[PDB]
Amino acid sequence: SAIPSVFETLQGYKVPVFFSRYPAGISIAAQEVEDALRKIDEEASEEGTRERRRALIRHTNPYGDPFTICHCSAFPDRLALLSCLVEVMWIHDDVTEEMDHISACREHDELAKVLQLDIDPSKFESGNVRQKSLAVVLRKAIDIDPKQAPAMIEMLRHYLATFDNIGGDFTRMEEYMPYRIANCGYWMSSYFIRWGMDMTLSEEEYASIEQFDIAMGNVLGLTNDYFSWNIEKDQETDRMRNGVVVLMKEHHTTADAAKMMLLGVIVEQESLAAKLKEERLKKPASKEILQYFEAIELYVGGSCYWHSTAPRYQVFE
Amino acid sequence: SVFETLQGYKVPVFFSRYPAGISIAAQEVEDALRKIDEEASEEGTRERRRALIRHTNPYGDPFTICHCSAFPDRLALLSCLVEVMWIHDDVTEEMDHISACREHDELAKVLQLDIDPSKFESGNVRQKSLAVVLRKAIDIDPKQAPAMIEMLRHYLATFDNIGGDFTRMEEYMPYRIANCGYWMSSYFIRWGMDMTLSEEEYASIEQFDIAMGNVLGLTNDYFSWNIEKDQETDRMRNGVVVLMKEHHTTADAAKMMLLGVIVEQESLAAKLKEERLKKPASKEILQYFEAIELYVGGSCYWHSTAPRYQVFE
Ligand SMILES: CC[N+](CC)(CC)Cc1ccccc1
Ligand SMILES: CC[N+](CC)(CC)Cc1ccccc1
Ligand SMILES: [Mg+2]
Ligand SMILES: [Mg+2]
Ligand SMILES: [Mg+2]
Ligand SMILES: [Mg+2]
Ligand SMILES: [Mg+2]
Ligand SMILES: [Mg+2]
């Protein structure tokens, strides 16, 4: 293995609905990260709100926490920070998916104002609770790695500007799929996979695995679609984001037939990623390339594993 | 301990959750298979060439992988027996249905507990070869030979006796389990391990077994669609076309749907096994679980790379 020994492997085969070819693990610092997440949940969502109730269900963990599983490759000190930072983004998602698109985009621009290299969390005392919590965690994530902080801030601003900026329905997979990689947060998550390992890829290194990265991004968000369809199908939204409804429209099929199609699409993207990795590895590969491969496979395989059994996608209104 | 475990994750198109192995007796079995291919098919025929292509094996032989759990003496017997059935399939698929059924009936005349192979030297080369190996297979296990013959007669009577097109999966899937030979192959998974299941033991895992049978034949459909879609037949058997007709989609969409159906059947089977294992389970039940998973996993592994299914340009 090319990444530090910070995780224990999970036996996915013991879970009947876990279908991924990729491995799953769980961080050795799981308890400590769960504590940080429950604390930030208290502060970044208000009592009595829907987003507070969803945050609690999201960290009801019969098989493990989503972050300690999916980001198990991260150094423990970094894992607590990136988990709480993405957790604030996930609370924001639950808040803004329920808003009309225009109001939602204002809220994204509001939260984006926290994204400063010189962020002072006190200057957001009269803001909403997500601004307050994000500024505090972001402050720490800058201070832990100031060399990477500009890139992280650029990544976070690009996310809030683009992940939810299209309002329509989609009618073809070939247009939905590129957008859903952004919408599902993969460019943020995969950034933090590298950041949590205190490593980067060069421009040339990234370009050499970019098609692989896109296939994995496809697997990650479409697998969430597959598992979150039941809870999403009756959600009241002006912009459903789920491959099942896209395929229903593109091919004029029932929900059930479209969900079978989606699962096949996912499995073929897992195979495409595996082919693309095989081709890359016919040329010499740096240690950094090898550890991105290993960690992103644990991210995608762990995500499948956690989604398979997460109360979030089964316990709803 | 008659097999080595394969690393399926190294094959990008291998998607099954189930394991794959290969027999320690692979070379012996392949020699016997090449031997029977010369005897049970005629030089320069279509079916001879398809049999040679079937055993080109960059990753291993169909039989040494899927039936890797069998004692090596039985493996060479059941592999050559099924192989004659496979040649027979290649021959009869391309015949009109009535002619095919007559050929199935002619072949079944060999299936008797007291077969005398010399009684068939004037018959066609598949009757000849099947009688020879059937004799040996009866004799290696006379106690099991009645059930074996019953199963083989049931197979030739029901695997290809429907002639129409299928327009719903609800009907296609139970028929495809038989049409793909799964009741023959799964019997030889038990026979090859010199064991059996009692009627109640089988009753307790029957839904599991149906789910695995669905996986097996539908996985073949997925990987063999590319060649079968242009084959001249009056009775195509492939879930892709069934789904195209039932849901009115393109072939590409139906193939995606079929892959999804397969993976959900693999999950269903794992759910059913987990349920069964909440009650006490005999050694035999545990043996079948482990060997049938190697069969289904190995079959996905072999199909995913077999030259048999390749199409070019
Ligand atoms: C990091 C992405 N997200 C988006 C809801 C948190 C903001 C959760 C998620 C993870 C994996 C797949 C889909 C969504
Ligand atoms: C064992 C069944 N068969 C039928 C062509 C030999 C008679 C090969 C086969 C194996 C698995 C799936 C489909 C076909
Ligand atoms: Mg969302
Ligand atoms: Mg959501
Ligand atoms: Mg979702
Ligand atoms: Mg056939
Ligand atoms: Mg055939
Ligand atoms: Mg076929």
Cα A165 from Cα B97, distance rounded (Å): 58
Query: Is residue A1, in this structure, part of any structural domain at all?
Result: no
- Tokens 């499995």 belong to A267
Choosing from B220, B221, B231, B308 the residue with most ligand 2 atoms within 8 A of its CB, the one to mutate for a pocket test is B220
E strands of chain A, at which residues?
Answer: 7-10, 24-27
Q: How big, in percent rounded to 5, are the helix, strand and coil portions of chain A? A: 65, 5, 30
- Chain B residues with beta carbon closer than 8 angstroms to that of A19: 17, 263, 266-267
For ligand 1, is residue A266 a contact (CB within 6 Å)?
no
- Chain B residues with beta carbon closer than 8 angstroms to that of A226: none
DSSP secondary structure, B273-307, as one string: HHHHTTS---HHHHHHHHHHHHHHHHHHHHHHH-G
For ligand 2, is residue B85 a contact (CB within 6 Å)?
yes
Count up the domains in chain A and report the number.
Answer: 1
Ligand showing the shortest atom-to-Cα distance for residue B214? 2
Q: B168, B207, B259, B273: best mutation site toward chain A, by most A Cβ within 10 Å?
A: B259
Cα A47 from Cα A133, distance rounded (Å): 15
Residue nearest ligand 1's atom 1 by CA: A185
Q: How far is the CA of A183 from the centre of ligand 3 (A)?
A: 6
B231-245 core/surface letters (b: 16 or more CB in 10 A; e: else)? eeeeebbbbbbbbbb
Query: Residue A249 CA to chain centroid, in angstroms?
Result: 26
Instruction: Look up the domain containing B92 and give its range.
Output: 3-309
Q: A263, A269, A293, A305: best mutation site toward chain B, by most B Cβ within 10 Å?
A: A263
With CA atoms as reference, the chain B residue closest to A173 would be: B253
What are the backbone dihedrals phi and psi of residue A105, each rounded to the nearest 5 degrees, phi first? -65, -35
Neighbours of ion ligand 5 (CB under 5 A): A 224, 228
8 Å CB contact between A181 and A188? no
Cα A74 from Cα A294, distance rounded (Å): 12
8 Å CB contact between B17 and B269? no
DSSP secondary structure, A41-86, as one string: HHHHS-TTSHHHHHHHHHT--TT--HHHHHTTTS-HHHHHHHHHHH
What are the backbone dihedrals phi and psi of residue B120, each rounded to the nearest 5 degrees, phi first? -125, 15
| 3-state SS assignment for residue A96 | helix
With CA atoms as reference, the chain B residue closest to A226 would be: B260
Cα A157 from Cα A161, distance rounded (Å): 6
| 3-state SS assignment for residue B22 | strand
CA angle B284, B63, B145 (to 5 degrees): 50
B179: how many CB neighbours lie within 10 A of its CB? 20
DSSP secondary structure, B161-199, as one string: ---S----HHHHHHHHHHHTTHHHHHHHHHHTTT----H
Cα A141 from Cα A198, distance rounded (Å): 12
Query: Is residue A279, in this structure, part of any structural domain at all?
Result: yes
For ligand 1, is residue A222 a contact (CB within 6 Å)?
no
Cα B223 from Cα B300, distance rounded (Å): 9
Q: What is the CA radius of gyration of chain A?
A: 19
Q: How far is the CA of A163 from the centre of ligand 3 (A)?
A: 9
B129: how many CB neighbours lie within 10 A of its CB? 27
Residue nearest ligand 1's atom 9 by CA: A184
Q: Extract the tokens encoding B204.
A: 């307790």
Cα A303 from Cα A299, distance rounded (Å): 6
Nearest Cα of chain B lies from the Cα of A232 at a distance, in angstroms, of 20
Q: How far is the CA of B225 from the centre of ligand 2 (A)?
A: 14
Query: B148: which residues sit within 8 A by CB, 6+ positions away?
Result: B137, B138, B141, B187, B191
Q: Extract the tokens encoding A191.
A: 């950034």
Cα A296 from Cα A74, distance rounded (Å): 11
What are the backbone dihedrals phi and psi of residue B88, each rounded to the nearest 5 degrees, phi first? -55, -40
Cα A238 from Cα A14, distance rounded (Å): 38
Cα B298 from Cα B304, distance rounded (Å): 10
Cα B185 from Cα B79, distance rounded (Å): 10
Burial of B124 per CB tally in 10 Å (0-12, 13-18, 19+): middle
Cα A215 from Cα A233, distance rounded (Å): 25
Query: A83: which residues sit within 8 A by CB, 6+ positions away?
Result: A33, A36, A37, A67, A68, A71
Cα A200 from Cα A190, distance rounded (Å): 11
Query: A36: which residues sit within 8 A by CB, 6+ positions away?
Result: A80, A83, A84
What are the backbone dihedrals phi and psi of residue B7, each rounded to the nearest 5 degrees, phi first? -100, 90
The minimum-distance atom of ligand 2 relative to the CA of B184 is 1
| 3-state SS assignment for residue B115 | coil
Q: Are strands B3-5 and B21-23 parallel, antiparallel or unpaired?
A: antiparallel
Q: Extract the tokens encoding A297.
A: 């496979």
- Tokens 């669609």 belong to B225
8 Å CB contact between A247 and B257? no
Q: How was this structure determined?
A: X-ray
Kindly determine whether residue A270 and residue B13, on different chains, have CB atoms separated by under 8 Å. Answer: no
Helices (H), ranges, B238-282 = 239-247, 251-276
- Chain A residues with beta carbon closer than 8 angstroms to that of B271: 16-17
Instruction: For residue A310, give Cα distances in angstroms to A27, A60, A193, A270.
Output: 17, 8, 21, 21
Query: A122: which residues sit within 8 A by CB, 6+ positions away?
Result: none
B201: how many CB neighbours lie within 10 A of its CB? 15
Q: Looking at the partner chain, which of A17, A257, A271 has a beta carbon nearest the beta carbon of B257?
A: A257
Cα B287 from Cα B296, distance rounded (Å): 14
Question: What number of CA atoms fall less than 13 Å from residue B49's CA on the CB side?
Answer: 3
Q: Extract the tokens encoding A23.
A: 């491995």
Query: Is residue A2, in this structure, part of any structural domain at all?
Result: no
| Of residues A64, A27, A58, A28, the one with CA closest to residue A44 | A58
User: Which CATH number fits the domain that encloses residue B163?
Assistant: 1.10.600.10
| Of residues A164, A178, A161, the one with CA closest to residue A221 | A178
Cα B81 from Cα B149, distance rounded (Å): 12
B131-143 core/surface letters (b: 16 or more CB in 10 A; e: else)? bbbbeebbebeee
Resolution (A): 2.0
Cα A159 from Cα A248, distance rounded (Å): 28
